[PDB]
Amino acid sequence: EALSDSGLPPVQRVVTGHDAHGRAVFKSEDVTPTRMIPSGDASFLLVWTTATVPADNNDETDGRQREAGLTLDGGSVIRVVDMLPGKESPMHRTNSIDYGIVLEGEIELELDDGAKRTVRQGGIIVQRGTNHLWRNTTDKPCRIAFILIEAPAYLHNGQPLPE
Template identity: 50%
Template structure:
């Protein structure tokens, strides 16, 4: 197995056709019905004719993190509101290992992470804007997706298509998929990704899609 190391995490490359895409270039047709930016046209947005064409944005959330004091009592060590270090999704927390090490004092949101963390976990929240859809992609992980608000469509390469609404959950088991927002409203989804072994079908490993996370805009 060949691997590519980067400062933003590790991507596994296995046998099979490599497909590269950037989450900052998720496709969107020119809106025709006056859809406008639902996240206040922040600097990273692509706006054309007064309409936001950015596929993803980082929703503002309140994050409460607990830990222990020097006597072993449970305490709150962080309580803050942020959009995370990346403008395209809010990276809430990561762990370097699974099972996690609760003795690790690293702020999980600041750990270098790609879409997944090799051997670890990732928790992020993202908002898919109206009229946008991701490319077909597969990650080397088991993913727990929770629709927090709005509606979106899950499409699989086998032809299945599922419409999801707030409160619905998806367990994505290393499958090739597309996320699509076909509505006039943004959709917010929480994703928990746990590093996983590759899926093997008829002796062939199903290769993950190498993904490039967008970099935050320069100040």
Template identity: 40%
Template sequence: MAINPLPLIRRVVTTHDDSGAAKVWIDEEVENKAPPGFSDGVSFGLAWTTNTSPADCQTPVDGKDLPIGELANTEGSVVRYVDMPPGHVSPMHRTLTLDYGFVLFGSVELSLPDGSRTPVKPGDLVVQRGTDHAWVNASETEWARMVYVLLPSKPIVVDGNELPPKSIHT
């Protein structure tokens, strides 16, 4: 397994003190972990999640400690970093979410079931609207990092049929 050369992820979370003044509550590095079943070096860093929408900005609970589903939260938001080693190809999957995916380092390709691949580079944004997709790091040498913001969506219905989610573990 290749060693990830990308910089550690830092999250800074603010809150209010007892008088209502803004202050930094959390300032720490985000733990990066391999998702179950993956051994090629890909890692996920969960930075924050909410379990309601609109969010409760007064909860004393650290958002990274809230339970979520496999990738998303059906009631709130998820912010996750994904580091992909050279040659990584994710399984084709679908979440029932609206995803904002930003490329921070390297470049990746958005792969769709029709075989199309759309290259995205640092600064690019992919708005993923509940469709089947996979991510490919086609580089032979360069790691890639994306950050995703996932928000719950209404079910996707095509021709009267509701499309189910597809796990990254199948």
């Protein structure tokens, strides 16, 4: 419980579960800052993961503390990413569909060949396994919640794309 390294508020996480009596109860609650990555471009927080999709509500593991699996981008991931002003992410593609929700500020999404657009605060991105980067061209941080869900490699003319 400190301000995030981006200068934005820490994030409350509330996790539910079942007790020994099969009742729905609160499992954990915490308020935790996003923290700076080495590049200094973004401040982030992992919130949860599932080892598989479909998920397992009999898996009592804390998703924030789960050992690394096999399948790159296997299962699901929810994290919070604070893009810092004047910064951008590395361009890349993943084997997933991602739902991105702009919580605070706004963000420039750039795809292939210079294509780009702005996603305003409250906006949602459906990222369908596309090559992209995120760029903050504003003077304030932008917070985005990302949910990444396993999908096979995208098939172009029945084959994987070049990286």
